[PDB]
Write a protein that binds this ligand. Structure first.
Ligand SMILES: CC[C@H](/C=C(/C)[C@@H]1C[C@@H](OC)C[C@H](O)C(C)(C)[C@@]2(O)O[C@@H](C[C@@H](OC)[C@H](O)C(=O)O1)C[C@@H](OC)[C@H]2O)CO
Ligand SMILES: Nc1nc2c(ncn2[C@@H]2O[C@H](COP(=O)(O)OP(=O)(O)OP(=O)(O)O)[C@@H](O)[C@H]2O)c(=O)[nH]1
Ligand SMILES: Nc1ncnc2c1ncn2[C@@H]1O[C@H](COP(=O)(O)OP(=O)(O)CP(=O)(O)O)[C@@H](O)[C@H]1O
Ligand SMILES: Nc1nc2c(ncn2[C@@H]2O[C@H](COP(=O)(O)OP(=O)(O)O)[C@@H](O)[C@H]2O)c(=O)[nH]1
Ligand SMILES: [Ca+2]
Ligand SMILES: [Mg+2]
Ligand SMILES: [Mg+2]
Lengths: 54, 428, 439, 265
């Protein structure tokens, strides 16, 4: 039961008790994915409106 | 996601529509002159979902009244809450539709539809954030069925990213006006499968049996039938009109209820079932509300839920009651009858509780089921359709309006596909 | 002094945020108008509470916080409520329509339209900082915004603030209070996309909190208000070391170094005690040994799981109130002979302990009794993977039939993302198994 | 009405257990993937312990103790017997000890005559949710039909008096009485109570019970040597009806009431 690194201040204290020792996408990439999803929405709506026009 | 635009078309559509507004005006404390007189702010919290604010604290239904003849709308204008509707929102022709889908969809209805869209557009444009649309109509006549679905198609074209919701009355021979009702219904379902996000299947067959057997009415009238409809409509829109967590807007409801786009046809139910001028003295318990709302004899689609499985269910409890009890009873039903709820959609039953009970009741519950058994309704319509179509009977009424036989064949095959698609998940 | 910005996303994130800040104000002696009598420095300072609060010339103490939601109704309650004066309007950000419980809708469709505004509002707070440590992000897994917009925001934060640490407080979905059938989808989708952007994530299962409110607070049917007050106690005890003078977990980075050896395995289990009903007229005041033993009871954990059948990588005990190191060590020593505590072989078997003399503050008229001592244990154990197994299974059931998938594809998300996300979770579950299981 | 699921079709023991429950009339068997159950008769490998006890409105139970594989895996058994403080001490009853375990061979055993044949002892041990230890009053002596060839093994893959090469306890007593009621009870509770803190579902959200098959080998001096524990044992015929009914009696019904032949260690 070794206690290491005891630190005390007026607000409280902290320490460590050891029982036993051991044995990203860029901005442009993000805009690209967002725009690809937007375009698929656009395409899907376009196909719907095409159907309705028929 | 606040404003809803309400549309009511044809005779059945306008008559149930009028009752809907009558009932929810009372619940929100709106008088027949459009002024508020309630004792709770819960009434006004979300009133903008169905009502516009005018001048002098006047509330006006965001409602559009459509018909191809003036009769039913003259009657509405004379009704108890007739003067609450905006005068300019009455749109009507003179010729009628003769119980003919083609006249509502292709000829007579086409002449009137732009003017309806003008009124729809005006309502939509002054919406802070339009949720979508709610349409009341029957499938068995000509205006509500043919022009109703024409409108839906036109609306989807201008407002493609909005939710389309319908209360659709299904015809039945037990309460029939004309023999062509299966033709009109089959043509309509075709439209509904493609162009609505959610349809409440209100079956005149089930409404009749409930009035006759359960409510012991020897001679049910359309009035008795509409009493059941307006109570159900109040119940299923409760989560949209009052503060709450679950299914609080049209799109969240669809996301919770519709796992596959075409399968969006709901079996509604209500408890306690009551006749007009009913005594209604003993309030029901939570276990009583719960057992009754789940009971097949209580469903308003004339299908047996016991023959199928629920994809999804929404339950709404109204009145002051114990939420602990409600949670217990809802878990009880599912745990004791787990086979009736598809295991591949975990926790597919969602419960809401609103403090404010409907008029005349201390406690009620509204059921909304997406059951594979709903195929029985479409199979029934398909049978009646086919008995006539095999002999080309009464087709001349439709070909005379420019329609071809092949459009009937196509409509019939699409409804058969729907039945097949429900059947494939009934055993999966 | 180094600053921390808090970010609350969606209803869950926002409502928990409000509970936390109310509590922070009570703990630091700050009134709803922002005035703080205790603070001798006016219009400035570099005290420990200045990591969460900035100051104006009028002596107003303003939270370094941003609230974001895609519909206005939840944040409207902040704008009009008790602590309306606390925040300035530009912190409180709302859109018009929500993500409808749809990750794709909050991430792709609506997220694209509001992300730049949110980031610029965040830059506004950041430019007020002399040394920004990073961000604390509060959100649900199940909501369209909490899941969809948060993962987008995290991605852009890694870009705009590459050095800064990011911590999550995440609400894991529970059917007893859930509002959507597709919550398992949103959970897996958001976890996949956020994984590489989050340094340490504190996961809270609503089921656990719900049952703790039922069994320990005698609340029949817990509301969000009940849940959030409990949650904000646990959050407070976790963030206290950044807000008060001390030497343990004093910066965001230290959370990772102390709790997270393997970057992907960054989900510490929180366990709290005691939770005592304010309604009891006779409180049996718990000792240090007692509240410390409670930390090893599944019943007190933020996620129900069994740490006996997993391995510990790290353990931190955070005490508030009348507690001395001697009694902690005596307690740890007893517990070691009565509990199944197995650490991974490449880590020391031990505890980092922090004590703050101020006993937990409670909200007046709340459900929580004031106690003389409390403890929150943070332990990176592989057992929390049980929560991923449960989630992954529900996902598997629906996805096999493609139930509800069309709602996501219709928002412009590709079906492949579903399987890319499930694979990441499959690997994540495999990583825990390698670390925690031996054969 | 109680509900349960079967996730291991091949269990001969729990096929009867399932057979017994349905016959009660107050048990409905569910699809394997239905989570709304009271009882789980689980798969042998990678049982989803993490998914139990998270169903509101349902007390759940499983027919396996998570972590008992430390006892029931030979390689695991050796480490546990060697490393654990209370089990390693006193351990005079364990022979000195893919992946393999080579362990000290008993030079000469007890030998029944006629035959000069070898045999082993399998006892059945049921542990319930309260962590009571329930030995089965009937044990099975699996025999080799061939004379000891200093045959070496009695596994059915490997019958003049012994029918199916099974001597049924009572006869053994008489042989002990002709040719020549402790060490077995001490061994069972030594192993299981050792692992108690690690596997007990005392205050868990779900509960466990498990059937174990303890295999024994006895020697010249009538000292009993334990060879391994079986996590998924099968019963001997004629003992199935009795044993399985007891499992229902004490491990299932005891938690799920309707409307002895175990010695409690
Ligand atoms: C659970 C979904 C559901 C399926 C079933 C089978 C459910 C189960 C239970 O309700 C939840 C039955 C229920 O517990 C009762 C026994 C009280 C009761 O209501 O059962 C019905 C008959 C029953 O079908 C036999 C019913 O029609 C029904 O639908 O039952 C008579 C009724 O007279 C007052 C009463 O005796 C379909 O939505
Ligand atoms: N603990 C807790 N959970 C909440 C709270 N509010 C919502 N939740 C949970 O959060 C999950 C998702 O809901 P929300 O956060 O409300 O959804 P959202 O982020 O606003 O996303 P959208 O409304 O779809 O745009 C559900 O599982 C709820 O149970 C809350 O105040 N406290
Ligand atoms: N130390 C020893 N002394 C004498 N015989 C031994 C022995 N170790 C093994 N044997 C003989 O070999 C047999 C091997 O059976 P073992 O228990 O190793 O595998 P098994 O076939 O029973 C698989 P299971 O785990 O399902 O029981 C022993 O029961 C015994 O007959
Ligand atoms: N429930 C109900 N059904 C009606 C009502 N009026 C008509 N129906 C049904 O509606 C169908 C006839 O359509 P209808 O609305 O009268 O024709 P339309 O004016 O051309 O739309 C038939 O199935 C009738 O049974 C009503 O007031 N209530
Ligand atoms: Ca200061
Ligand atoms: Mg008519
Ligand atoms: Mg929201």
């Amino acid at each position: 039961m070794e206690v290491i690194e005891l630190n005390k201040c007026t607000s409280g204290q902290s320490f460590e008790v050891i029982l036993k020792p051991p044995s990203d996408p860029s901005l442009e990439e993000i805009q690209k994915k967002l725009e690809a999803a937007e375009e698929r929405r656009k395409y899907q709506e376009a196909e719907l409106l095409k159907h309705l026009a028929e | 996601m606040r404003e809803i635009v309400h549309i009511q078309a044809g005779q059945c559509g306008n008559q149930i529509g009028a009752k809907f507004w009558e009932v929810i005006s009372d619940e929100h404390g709106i008088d027949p002159t459009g002024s508020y007189h309630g004792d709770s702010d819960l009434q006004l919290e979300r009133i903008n979902v169905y009502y516009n604010e005018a001048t002098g604290n006047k509330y006006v239904p965001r409602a559009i009244l459509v018909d191809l003849e003036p009769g039913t709308m003259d009657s509405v204008r004379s009704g108890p809450f007739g003067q609450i509707f905006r005068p300019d929102n009455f749109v009507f022709g003179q010729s009628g539709a003769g119980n003919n889908w083609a006249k509502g969809h292709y000829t007579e209805g086409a002449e009137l539809v732009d003017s309806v869209l003008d009124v729809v557009r005006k309502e939509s444009e002054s919406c802070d954030c339009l949720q979508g649309f709610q349409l009341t109509h029957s499938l068995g006549g000509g205006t509500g069925s043919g022009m109703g679905t024409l409108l839906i198609s036109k609306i989807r074209e201008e407002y493609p990213d909005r939710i389309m919701n319908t209360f659709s009355v299904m015809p039945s021979p037990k309460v029939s006006d004309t023999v062509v009702e299966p033709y009109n219904a089959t043509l309509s379902v075709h439209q509904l499968v493609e162009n609505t996000d959610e349809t409440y299947c209100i079956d005149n067959e089930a409404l009749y049996d409930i009035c006759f057997r359960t409510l012991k009415l020897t001679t049910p009238t359309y009035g008795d039938l509409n009493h059941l409809v307006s109570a159900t409509m109040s119940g299923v829109t409760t989560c949209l009109r009052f503060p709450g967590q679950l299914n609080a807007d049209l799109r969240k409801l669809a996301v919770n209820m519709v796992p596959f786009p075409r399968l969006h046809f709901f079996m509604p139910g209500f408890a306690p079932l009551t006749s007009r001028g009913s005594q209604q003295y003993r309030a029901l318990t939570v276990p009583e509300l719960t057992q009754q709302m789940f009971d097949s004899k209580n469903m308003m689609a004339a299908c047996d839920p016991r023959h199928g499985r629920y994809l999804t269910v929404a339950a709404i409890f109204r009145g002051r009651m114990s939420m602990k009890e409600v949670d217990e009873q809802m878990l009880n039903v599912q745990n004791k009858n787990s086979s009736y709820f598809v295991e591949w959609i975990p926790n597919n039953v969602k419960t809401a509780v609103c403090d404010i009970p409907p008029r005349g009741l201390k406690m009620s519950a509204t059921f909304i089921g997406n059951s594979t058994a709903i195929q029985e309704l479409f199979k029934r319509i398909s049978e009646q359709f086919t008995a006539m179509f095999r002999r080309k009977a009464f087709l001349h009424w439709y070909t005379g309006e420019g329609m071809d036989e092949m459009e009937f064949t196509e409509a019939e095959s699409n409804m058969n596909d729907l039945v097949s698609e429900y059947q494939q998940y009934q055993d999966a | 002094m180094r600053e921390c910005i808090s970010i609350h996303v969606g209803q869950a994130g926002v409502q928990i945020g409000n509970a936390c800040w109310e509590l922070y104000c009570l703990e630091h002696g700050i009134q709803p108008d922002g005035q703080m009598p205790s603070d001798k420095t006016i219009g400035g300072g570099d005290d420990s509470f200045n990591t969460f609060f900035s100051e104006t010339g009028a002596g107003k103490h303003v939270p370094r916080a941003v609230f974001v939601d895609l519909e206005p109704t939840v944040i409207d309650e902040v704008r009009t409520g008790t602590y309306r004066q606390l925040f300035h309007p530009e912190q409180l950000i709302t859109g018009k329509e929500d993500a409808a419980n749809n990750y794709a809708r909050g991430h792709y469709t609506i997220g694209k339209e509001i992300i730049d505004l949110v980031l610029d509002r965040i830059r506004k707070l950041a430019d007020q900082c002399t040394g920004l440590q990073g961000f604390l992000v509060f959100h649900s897994f199940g909501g369209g915004t909490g899941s969809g917009f948060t993962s987008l925001l995290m991605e852009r934060l890694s870009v705009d603030y590459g050095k800064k640490s990011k911590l999550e407080f995440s609400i894991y979905p529970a059917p007893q209070v859930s509002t959507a059938v597709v919550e398992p989808y949103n959970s897996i989708l958001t976890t996949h996309t956020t994984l590489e952007h989050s340094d340490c994530a504190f996961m809270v299962d609503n089921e656990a909190i719900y049952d703790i409110c039922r069994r320990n607070l005698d609340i029949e049917r817990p509301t969000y208000t009940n849940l959030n007050r409990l949650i904000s106690q646990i959050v407070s005890s976790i963030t206290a070391s950044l807000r008060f003078d001390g030497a343990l977990n004093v910066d965001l980075t230290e959370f990772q170094t102390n709790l997270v050896p393997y970057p992907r395995i960054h989900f510490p289990l929180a366990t709290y005690a005691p939770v005592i009903s304010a309604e009891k007229a006779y409180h049996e005041q718990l000792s240090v040994a007692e509240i410390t033993n409670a930390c090893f009871e599944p019943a007190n954990q933020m996620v129900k799981c069994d740490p006996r059948h997993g391995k510990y990588m790290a353990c931190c005990l955070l005490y508030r109130g009348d507690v001395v190191p001697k009694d902690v060590n005596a307690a740890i020593a007893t517990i070691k002979t009565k509990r199944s505590i197995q650490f991974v072989d490449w880590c020391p078997t031990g505890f980092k302990v922090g004590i703050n003399y101020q006993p937990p503050t409670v909200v007046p008229g709340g459900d929580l009794a004031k106690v003389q001592r409390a403890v929150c244990m943070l332990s990176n154990t592989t057992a929390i993977a049980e929560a991923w197994a449960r989630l992954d299974h529900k996902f598997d059931l629906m996805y096999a039939k493609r139930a509800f998938v069309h709602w996501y594809v219709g928002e412009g998300m590709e079906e492949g993302e579903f399987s890319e996300a499930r694979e990441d979770m499959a690997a994540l579950e495999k990583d825990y198994e390698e670390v925690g299981v031996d054969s | 009405m109680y509900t349960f699921v079967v996730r291991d079709e091949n269990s001969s023991v729990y096929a009867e257990v399932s057979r017994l429950l349905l016959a009660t009339g107050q048990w409905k068997r569910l699809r394997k993937d239905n989570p709304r159950f009271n009882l789980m008769l689980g798969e042998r490998n990678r049982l989803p312990f993490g998914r139990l006890g998270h169903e509101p409105g349902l007390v759940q139970l499983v027919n396996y103790y998570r972590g008992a594989d430390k006892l029931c895996r030979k390689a695991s058994l050796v480490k546990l017997i060697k490393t654990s403080p209370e089990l390693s001490e006193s351990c005079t009853w364990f022979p000195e000890s893919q992946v393999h375990v080579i362990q000290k061979y008993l030079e000469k055993p007890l030998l029944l005559e006629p035959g000069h044949r070898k045999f082993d002892i399998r006892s059945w041990v049921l542990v319930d949710h309260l962590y009571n230890i329930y030995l089965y009053r009937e044990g099975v002596l699996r025999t080799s039909s061939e004379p000891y060839n200093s045959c070496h093994l009695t596994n059915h893959c490997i019958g003049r008096y012994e029918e199916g090469n099974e001597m049924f306890f009572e006869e053994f007593n008489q042989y002990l009485m002709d040719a020549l009621e402790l060490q077995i009870k001490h061994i069972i509770r030594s192993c299981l109570m050792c692992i108690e803190p690690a596997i007990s579902t005392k205050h868990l959200h779900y509960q466990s019970f498990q059937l174990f098959g303890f295999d024994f080998m006895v020697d010249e001096e009538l000292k009993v040597w334990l060879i391994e524990v079986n996590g998924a044992p099968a019963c001997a015929q004629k003992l199935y009806a009795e044993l399985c009914q007891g499992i229902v009696d004490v491990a299932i019904s005891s938690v799920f009431p309707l409307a002895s032949i175990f010695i409690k260690l």
